[PDB]
């Protein structure tokens, strides 16, 4: 089927893209939560 | 009905892959 | 499968260019 072939090719490309997205998210979220905790603990200690 | 079947399958694939990340971000924010 | 390859490439280009700005705004808001 031409359409089965289409979906199969799409799956490969999508898998790579999801891989890149996971890498970005980790770095950004690391920073965000880091800053949040810094602000929190500094204020409680003071 | 091959076209319909494989185009719908392609919507559900994109919904699953992204929502994975939506759950990470959420669970993280709340926990911290 | 040229059409598929180059249309998907065009989705990923738009995702990258915009998200750049999403990160600027976020990092700024939190830092301040």
């Amino acid at each position: 089927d031409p359409a089965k072939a289409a979906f199969d090719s799409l799956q490969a490309s999508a898998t790579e893209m999801i891989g890149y997205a996971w890498a970005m998210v980790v770095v950004i979220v690391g920073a965000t939560i880091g800053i949040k905790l810094f602000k929190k603990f500094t204020s409680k200690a003071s | 009905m091959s076209v319909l079947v494989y185009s719908f399958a392609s919507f559900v694939l994109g919904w699953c892959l992204r929502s994975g990340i939506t759950y990470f971000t959420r669970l993280m924010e709340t926990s911290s | 499968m040229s059409v598929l390859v180059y249309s998907f490439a065009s989705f990923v280009l738009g995702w990258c260019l915009r998200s750049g700005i999403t990160y600027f705004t976020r990092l700024m808001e939190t830092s301040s």
């Binding site: - | 185009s7 892959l17 959420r26 | -």
Partner: peptide, 28 residues
């Protein structure tokens, strides 16, 4: 040729339903 057009339609369709899926997924 009709067949060229046919194949193109299918290919574009698959990608467009993926993108709408992705958008649906990031809705909080």
């Amino acid at each position: 040729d009709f067949d060229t057009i046919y194949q193109a339609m299918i290919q574009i369709s698959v990608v467009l339903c993926f993108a709408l899926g992705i958008i649906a997924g990031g809705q909080r």
